[PDB]
C-alpha cells in the first residue's frame, strides 16, 4: 500500500526486543535445560561405576 | 447505517495514521501526502504483542527450575529446544546473537499473524463506538511497513556479518567473481550478485506481507458480501486452512533469516 | 461506461491461471505422496503430515490470486 | 585408486588396488572411478576391464554376476 | 451490447483454464495411483482412500473458478 | 453483428482448452495403465476397473466445459 | 467487415487446441505402449488391444472439437 | 446491508471454529506437554535411583 | 478490403499449433521407441512396425488442421 | 480514467503468472522431498531442513511479482 | 495498408510455433538416442540410423509451417 | 496519458514471465539436489556447494528481466 | 509514424519463441549427454561429438527464425 | 503518441520469453549435472567442463534476444 515512517518506527520497536531477549531471556533459559541435562549425564556416569 | 458493502469493505482497508506535523489523526476520506504519518494501530499491536511475549518469557526465565518443570515451563522450554535445534542444525559459528534473534522472530511473528484469527468486526466495532476512533484494522503483519522493517533489519545484519567474517576484500571478491570466475565478466557479476543479495530481504518481507494481507482480505470479503446464515460455511474452512499459513509464515521467516546469516558468515 | 467489463475479464484470467497452477502443483505433490504410500503403507499418516505441510506452501500464491480476483470482481464493481 | 575384489563362490579371482574398471552392466556398459556413489547391479557375461595402479591393463572373463 | 458481450469471453477463459488444471492434475495423481496399485494390488482399497482424500484438495480451487464462471454467465448475464 | 459473431470465439476457446485438458489428462493416466499392465498382464481386468474409476473424475470438469460451449453456441447464440 | 474473418479464427483456435491435445496425449500413451512392447515382446497383441481401448477415450473430445470447427467454417460461414 | 447482521454472521463461524480447535488442536498440544513432563519425571527418577 | 489478410492469420495459428503438437507427440513416441530399441537390438523391426502403427494414430489430427490451413490460405484467400 | 481500466489487467497478468511459477516449482521440489522421505525415514528432519533451504530461493521472484501486483492494484489503483 | 503489416505477424507466429515444435521434438528424441549411445556404444551406428529414420518424421509438420511462413514473408510480402 | 497504462502492462508481462522461469528452473534443480541428498546425506555440504553454484547460472537472466521491469515501472514511470 | 511499430512486435514473437525452443530443446538434449558422461567418463570424447551431431539438427529452425527475425527487424524496418 | 509504448511491449515480450527459455534450459541441464556429480564425486571438474561447454550453447539465442531487447528499449 503506502510506505510510511512507520517502517522506521518498527525498526526502533524491533531492536530492543532483540537485546532484552539476548540478555534477560535466552541465557537464563538455556541454563535451565543444560543443568538438568548435566545432572542426567552424571547420573549415567554413576550408573556406569555402580556395576564397574 | 448507510453501508454499501463495497464501502464497508472500503473502510476496513484503512489504517489509523497519525499525521506527525499536526500530530493528529489522518481522516480516511482524504489521505494527506507525506512520509511522516505513522500507522498507529499496526505499530500499537506490534509493541503490545512484543511486550506480552517478553513478559511471559521473563515469567519463566527468572523462575525456571531444573527439576521436574511446571506445565507452563514445559511449553517455553519446548519452544526453546525447537528453536535451538533449528539453529544448531544450520549454523555452527560462535556468535551469541543468532539464537535469541530467531526466538524473537518466531514468537513475535506467530502472535502477529495469530491476530488475524480474531473476528474481523470485533475490535473495529469497539474502537470507534466506544473510543470514537475513525479507523482500525488489527493485524500488524498485514502492512508492508512492519514486514519491510523487520526485513531491512535482517538486511543490515547480513551486511554486518558478511563484513565481520570475511572483510571488504573477500566481500568484493564474492561480489565480482561469482558466477563466471573470469575477471572480464566482473562488470556483469557486480550487478547480478547485487540483485541476488538485495532480493533476499525484499523477498522475505513481501512473502509475509502478501500472505497475511490476503488472509485478512478474504475475511473482509466473506463478512461483507454474504448473509448471516451463510458466512460461517466459508469463514470456518478458511480459518482452519489459515492456521497452517499463520504457522508456516513465521517458521519460514525464522528459518530463512537463520540461513541467510549462517551463509553470510560461514 | 467502459470501466467495468475489463474487471471481470481480469478476474477471470487471474483465477484461471491460479487454478492451473494450484491444481497441477498439488497433483505432482500428491502423486509422489501416493507412490511413497505404496512403498511404506504403515507410514501413511506421517507422509500425510508432510504432505499437508508442503501443500500449505504450494497454495500460498494461488490463494492470494483468488482473493484479489474476487475483490476486483465484487469489491471494485 | 580404490580396492577391488573379484570373487566366485569357489575361489578369489582378483584382488588389489585399481585405478578404474569398465563393466557391461545389465542395463548398459558402465565405468567405476574412485569415490563412485554406492551402486548395486547385475552384470552380463563378458570381459571386465581393469587398469591396475600404474596403468597396467588386463581383461578378466566373467560369466556374469552381481556388482 | 459489448457490456453484455465480453462476459462470455471472460467466463469461457475462466472455465477453460479451470478444466485444464483439474484434468491435468487429476491425471497425474491417478497415474501415480495406478502405478502404486499395479506394484502391490492387495493395497488398492487403502490407496484409493488416500487418492480420494487428495483429489478434493486438487479440485478445491478449479471448482471455485468454475462456480464463478457459471455466475458470470447466468447471474451477471 | 459482433453481439453474436464474437460469441463463437468464446465457445471456441472454452472447448478448445477443455479438449487439451481432457486429452492429456487421460493420456498421462492411460500411460501408467499400460505400464502396470505389461508388468503384471494377468491383472488387467482389476486395473482396467480402477482406470475407469478415476477416468470419470478426470473428465468431470472438461465435459461441462464442452456443454457450456455448445450451450453458448445454441442457447444464447 | 466484422463477420466472416472471425469465424475462421474461432475454428482456427478450436482445431489448433484440439490438435495439440490429441497429438500429445496419443504420443504419451503410445510411448508407454512401446516400452511395454519392448519388455513383453510376446504380448504385443494384448497390450495393443488395451491401447486401442483407451485411445478410444483419449481422442473423443478432441474430435468433438474438430467436427464443430468444421461445422463453423463450412456450415455457418 | 445492516452491520448488525454481519456481526451476527461472524459470531457463529467464530464459535464453530473455536470448538473445532478445542477438539482437534488443543488436545495434541496438551498431549505433547504431558509427554515432555512424563519424560523428565522418568529421567530424573532414573538419575536419583542410579546415585543410590 | 482489409479482410483479405486475417485468413492468413487464422491459417497461421491453425497450422503452427498442429506443427507443435505433431512434432512433440512424435518426439515422445520416437524417444520411447529408441529406448526400447537400444535394449532389444534384435527386435527393432517389430518395434518399428508398432511404432509406425501408433504414429499414424498420432499425426492424424495435425494433418486435418494442416489441410484446413492450406485450404484457407490458398483456396479461400 | 483509463488507468483504472488497464492496471487491473496488468496486475492480473502479473499475479496469475507468479502463481503458475510458484505453484509448479514448489510442487516439483516437494515431490522430490516426499519421495526422498519414503525412501528413508529417520532422515525426514534433515531432508525437511534442506527442503526449506531450497524453497526459500524458489519463491523469491514470484514473491517480488506478487508484491508489485498488490502495490499497483492498491497503491496506484 | 494493414495488409502490408499484419502479414508479417502471420509468418512470425507460423515460424515461431514451428521452431518450438521442431526444437522440442528433436531435443527429446536426441536425448533418448544419446542415453542409449552412452549405454550401448556397440550399437551406436544402428541407433543413429534409426534416429535419422524417426527424426525425418518429426520435422515434416514443422517444415510445412516454415515453408508457408517464408512464402508469406516474401511472395505475398 | 495513454503511455503509462501500457508501460505498466508491459512490466507486468515481463516480470510474470521472469517469475515463471526462475521459479520452475530452480525447482527442477532443487529436485535433483534433494534426491541426491536422500541417497547419501553425508555428501550434503558438497552437494549444497554445487547447488548454490549452478543456481546463479539459472538465476542469471530472470534477475535482468525483473531489474528492467522495475526500471520501466518506476524510473521511466 | 505508423508502419514501424507493429513490425518490432513481429520481430519479437519470432525471436521469443525461437529462444524458448532452442534453449529448452538443447537443455533436454544436454541433460542426457551429461547422464551418459557420468556413467562412462571413458566415452566423453565419443559422446561429445554425437551431442554436436544431434545438436545441429535441433536448433536448425530456431537459427532460421533468428535470421528472419533480424531481417524484419532491420531490413524491412 | 501511440508509438513508444508498443516498443516497450515488444522488448518486454522478447526479454520475458528469453527468461523462460534460459532459466528452464539451464534448470534441466543443471539438474542432470547435479545428479551426475553426486554419482561420480571425483570427476566433478571434468563434468563441470562439460556443463559449461553445453551451457554456452543453451544461452546463445537467449543472449541474442536479451541484447535485442535492451537495444529496442534504449536504442529506440
Numbering used by the authors:
A (entry chain X), H (entry chain Y): 1 to 52
B (entry chain a): 4 to 269
C (entry chain L), E (entry chain Q), F (entry chain I), G (entry chain P), I (entry chain O), J (entry chain J), ...: 3 to 79
D (entry chain H): 3 to 69
N (entry chain R): 3 to 78
The publication says:
A key component in the generation of cellular metabolic energy is the F1Fo ATP synthase, a biological rotary motor that converts the proton motive force (pmf) to adenosine tri-phosphate (ATP) in both oxidative phosphorylation and photophosphorylation. The enzyme is comprised of two rotary motors, termed F1 and Fo, that are coupled together by two stalks: a central “rotor” stalk and a peripheral “stator” stalk. The Fo motor spans the membrane and converts the potential energy from the pmf into mechanical rotation of the central rotor that, in turn, drives conformational changes in the catalytic F1 motor subunits to generate ATP from ADP and inorganic phosphate (Pi).
Focused classification of rotational State 1 highlighted five sub-classes, here termed Sub-states 1A, 1B, 1C, 1D, and 1E; with resolutions of 3.1, 3.3, 3.1, 3.2, and 3.3 Å, respectively. The defining theme of these sub-states was flexing of the central and peripheral stalks, with the majority of the flexibility seen in the peripheral stalk which bends and twists, together with minor movements within the central stalk. Independently, the movements seen between Sub-states 1B-E do not facilitate rotation of the c10 ring and instead illustrate torsional flexing of the entire complex. Sub-state 1A was in one rotational sub-state (here termed Sub-state 1’), whereas Sub-states 1B-E were rotated by a single c subunit relative to Sub-state 1’ (here termed Sub-state 1”). When all the density corresponding to protein had been assigned, tube-like non-protein density likely corresponding to lipid molecules were observed in multiple locations within the membrane bound Fo-motor. The strongest of these densities were observed between residues aI225–aQ234 and a single c subunit, where three of these tubes of density were present on the periplasmic side and one on the cytoplasmic side of the enzyme. This additional density was observed in most of the maps but was clearest in the highest resolution maps, Sub-states 1C and 3A, and the focused Fo map of Sub-state 3A. In the cryo-EM maps of the intact F1Fo enzyme in the presence of 10 mM MgADP, all α subunits contained ATP and Mg2+, whereas the contents of the β subunits varied: β1 bound ADP, Mg2+ and Pi, β2 bound only ADP, and β3 bound ADP and Mg2+.
